[PDB]
Amino acid sequence: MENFQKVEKIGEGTYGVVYKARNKLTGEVVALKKIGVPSTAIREISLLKELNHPNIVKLLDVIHTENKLYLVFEFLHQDLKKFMDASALTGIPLPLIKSYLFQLLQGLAFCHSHRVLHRDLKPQNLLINTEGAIKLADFGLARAFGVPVRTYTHEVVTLWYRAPEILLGCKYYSTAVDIWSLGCIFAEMVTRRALFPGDSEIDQLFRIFRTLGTPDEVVWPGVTSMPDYKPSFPKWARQDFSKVVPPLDEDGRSLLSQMLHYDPNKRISAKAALAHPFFQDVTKPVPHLR
Numbered sequence: 527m528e529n530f531q532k533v534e535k536i537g538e539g540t541y542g543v544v545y546k547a548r549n550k551l552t553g554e555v556v557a558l559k560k561i562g563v564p565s566t567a568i569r570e571i572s573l574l575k576e577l578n579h580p581n582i583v584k585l586l587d588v589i590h591t592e593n594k595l596y597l598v599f600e601f602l603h604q605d606l607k608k609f610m611d612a613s614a615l616t617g618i619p620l621p622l623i624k625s626y627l628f629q630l631l632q633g634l635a636f637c638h639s640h641r642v643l644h645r646d647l648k649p650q651n652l653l654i655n656t657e658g659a660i661k662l663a664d665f666g667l668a669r670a671f672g673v674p675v676r677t678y679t680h681e682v683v684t685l686w687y688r689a690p691e692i693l694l695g696c697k698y699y700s701t702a703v704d705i706w707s708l709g710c711i712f713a714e715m716v717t718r719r720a721l722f723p724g725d726s727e728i729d730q731l732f733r734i735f736r737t738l739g740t741p742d743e744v745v746w747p748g749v750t751s752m753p754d755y756k757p758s759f760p761k762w763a764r765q766d767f768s769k770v771v772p773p774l775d776e777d778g779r780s781l782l783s784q785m786l787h788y789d790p791n792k793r794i795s796a797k798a799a800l801a802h803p804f805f806q807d808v809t810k811p812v813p814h815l816r
């Protein structure tokens with residue numbers, strides 16, 4: 527595209543590559559995502575340009591030229607995964623963790639009220655600035671194309687944040703999947719280890735089952751009728767969160783437990799999450815950004 531100077535490759539997506547670039551007119555610097563895109567795709571993506579929220583990475587333009595689609599986004603200078611690697615040694619303080627989870631819930635509360643889900647939340651698509659904001663990136667991209675097993679660079683698309691209804695074959699899942707992803711990310715920022723690092727689908731499910739208990743009709747009506755449910759699934763006993771996310775306080779474990787309910791129908795909504803006591807004292811710290 528003529529209108530942009532690519533200034534650097536910043537990343538590789540499932541769908542495409544990201545370059546930092548400069549609007550050759552506005553001189554705005556933007557993140558330029560390179561993915562005749564089969565055209566529900568176009569309609570459903572061009573739509574996101576009005577799904578605007580402070581904790582949503584602004585989608586400034588879509589440009590469809592030849593067999594290429596560029597998505598043009600406000601540039602944020604880094605992602606949650608690098609910031610969390612940048613704080614292995616100490617971890618993100620708790621007050622910043624809370625503020626991020628709060629901001630992310632606001633993002634989701636908004637998308638979800640407009641019936642839009644992300645479906646692929648993960649630290650790599652949460653972008654942070656130096657003013658203590660965090661935003662969700664890559665919406666409607668999973669609806670508009672479905673998520674593949676490799677990326678365009680043949681890289682493995684991670685299952686670590688994927689809700690159990692999706693892993694169980696559910697075709698028609700809901701805004702709850704994103705709450706499950708955000709729960710996994712919340713536990714990961716507190717402990718500095720991913721919570722469920724599956725390396726395949728059945729490994730992902732079994733790491734889930736090992737921590738939260740193999741699900742049954744007690745905890746999740748309808749689950750034994752799911753498409754990839756098997757009676758032969760080993761029966762693991764649930765485990766106490768106090769062990770899973772120390773040192774989260776009671777209010778944060780209580781909220782985590784609700785974002786991780788097996789039954790998407792019981793899993794706390796974003797709206798409800800925003801009201802939980804864990805946020806009574808939430809403040810917006812400044813990240814240490816390097």
Ligand SMILES: O=[N+]([O-])c1cccc(/N=C2/N=CCC(c3cccc(Cn4cncn4)c3)=N2)c1
Nearest residue numbers: 536537538539544557599600601602603604663
């Ligand atoms: O993960 N990054 O490429 C990355 C690193 C550092 C800064 C970055 N800045 C932005 N700013 C706005 C949007 C944006 C972005 C947009 C869509 C998807 C993603 C996630 N992704 C990462 N690689 C491919 N996609 C990031 N990145 C991105």
